[PDB]
């Protein structure tokens with residue numbers, strides 16, 4: 173974990189990427205929720221396989237692994253959502269067969285627009301895939317900490333910087349972009365909080381799930 | 387305007403803009419905190435107006451940023467004051483509450499303690515603190531409304547790095563510490579949302595700015 177170079181870290185994260193799942197082959201509030209709920213359920217399974225391939229995660233106790241996934245699972249789904257929705261302005265790509273707009277469930281339009289704004293921010297910054305997988309790993313490891321983990325987090329920070337330095341950015345630009353990316357995570361946390369609020373205002377067996385994976 | 391300020395000039399402006407540490411009046415624990423928060427809000431507006439680049443913004447934008455960040459700013463201030471008091475939160479010098487003094491807020495309290503311990507373990511400096519508080523003000527509501535904000539945010543980033551470089555930290559330790567600090571802002575946002583929904587369980591901002 174702490175032995176990996178920045179390049180080894182990147183390739184390991186890239187190859188550990190979860191597959192793009194499909195929705196079940198007009199919508200109502202109930203039907204829309206059912207599709208999204210089912211999609212998220214099947215995605216959680218792959219998220220666990222991905223998490224167990226994130227450097228330093230399996231080094232943790234099963235107790236800590238459950239706690240980190242329980243806190244970050246919606247954040248991870250959301251950043252995954254806004255990432256694949258980058259090439260679709262004004263639209264969210266939940267699934268290749270499920271591309272929705274603003275007009276496409278009461279109480280969700282606020283978080284929907286927040287996800288759209290985040291996607292536009294990534295597109296404006298021209299977020300790269302190598303940067304995306306680093307941000308996703310950070311979310312997993314940081315969302316539920318409150319010195320092994322912090323050292324792994326520092327390693328991912330070095331990896332991000334390495335990617336920016338290799339891209340030709342000046343050290344000032346490296347620090348600025350790093351700051352810009354990590355501040356977005358605060359907004360992703362915000363969207364998750366509102367999401368966890370609204371959703372639980374069917375798919376929560378991460379403790380159950382992770383244990384049956386063993 | 388503020389885009390011409392140096393790192394040291396940015397620090398000096400923020401340090402001198404710092405709000406005073408208010409006192410509590412010499413169950414009803416909520417009443418005291420509500421009153422304290424009310425009086426702190428007035429000074430927060432004065433502080434915000436002195437944050438470099440904040441007055442260059444639309445007033446409606448100034449209001450939006452303040453309403454989105456006001457609890458985050460109150461909390462990071464609390465965490466800052468409580469740094470030298472392990473296991474306690476210093477809402478006021480005469481209002482120092484323990485963990486068990488903290489229905490349901492014991493969760494919010496523990497998160498505030500944990501944040502206080504981290505800043506203590508990181509040995510957060512005052513110059514770093516005022517920068518973090520400035521970031522919170524400018525970043526918390528930027529995705530719920532122009533490019534001026536991001537420019538100002540970029541120079542606060544420049545300021546933070548400068549402070550770390552002056553402290554003697556290596557260039558690797560600089561971006562690592564920068565990352566650690568900003569990741570804590572995510573948890574502060576989390577505490578605010580959890581706090582905001584408990585206060586649940588703001589158009590007067592324009593008046594104070596008018």
Ligand SMILES: CC(F)(F)c1cc(F)ccc1-c1sc2cc(O)ccc2c1Oc1ccc(/C=C/C(=O)O)cc1
Pocket residue numbers: 205208209211212215249250252253266280283284287366367368370371374375376
């Ligand atoms: C706006 C919105 F739809 F994204 C959205 C707005 C919110 F307030 C909250 C969540 C969302 C999301 S984002 C996520 C991204 C994707 O990769 C896949 C699914 C969707 C998921 O839909 C979901 C997600 C989880 C559940 C769980 C319910 C249960 O356990 O009973 C139900 C529907």
Ligand SMILES: CC(F)(F)c1cc(F)ccc1-c1sc2cc(O)ccc2c1Oc1ccc(/C=C/C(=O)O)cc1
Pocket residue numbers: 416419420422423426460461463464477488491494495498580581582584585
């Ligand atoms: C008490 C606590 F910190 F745990 C806590 C847990 C939460 F879930 C949410 C907020 C808090 C806090 S943090 C803040 C830090 C300080 O500088 C000053 C006061 C306190 C404030 O007490 C408050 C703050 C605001 C209000 C608003 C009431 C209204 O508008 O009517 C009421 C009480």
